[PDB]
């Protein structure tokens, strides 16, 4: 037998207020400019 | 047997408040100018 | 018989406030300019 | 001044020959059997 | 001046032939089974 | 000045043949059976 459960992953888990810039969570690739 | 479940993933799990920026999740390629 | 469960991962664990750079998760590749 | 150009991002660069299972490029969340 | 030119990046950079399993170049949460 | 050129990453770089279990590049979170 095998279980798996109850995994959990999370990028931001509390508020994130009055950005001026750039917040990204899993960028592949890409150019950012701020 | 195998029995696989209840994962969770999650990005932002709180509040964004008054963004004037980029709020990305997941980007692949591509650019930002913030 | 295996048991696996209840593993937690967090990038940001509380509040991004007044942001004005750049906050990124996981970047692959990719140039960031702040 | 600021030029950025000529980023080159490649999943698979050759044959993908007689496959009989999953190939997949970028997956996020999701299930697969195989 | 800031010039940023030419990165490159690759998963599979050859032939990938035959498979009977699971081939994935980028995955983010998410259950395999082979 | 600064000049940023020429990067280069990749994660196979030669064939692969004849899986039968689960090949990946960049696993985040997530759970592999083979």
Do not use: R, T, W
């Not at 999370?10 to 508020?15: I, K, L, Q, T, W």
């Amino acid at each position: 037998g095998y279980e798996v459960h109850h995994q959990k992953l999370v990028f931001f888990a509390e508020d994130v207020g009055s950005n001026k810039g750039a917040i990204i969570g899993l960028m592949v690739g890409g150019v950012v400019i701020a």
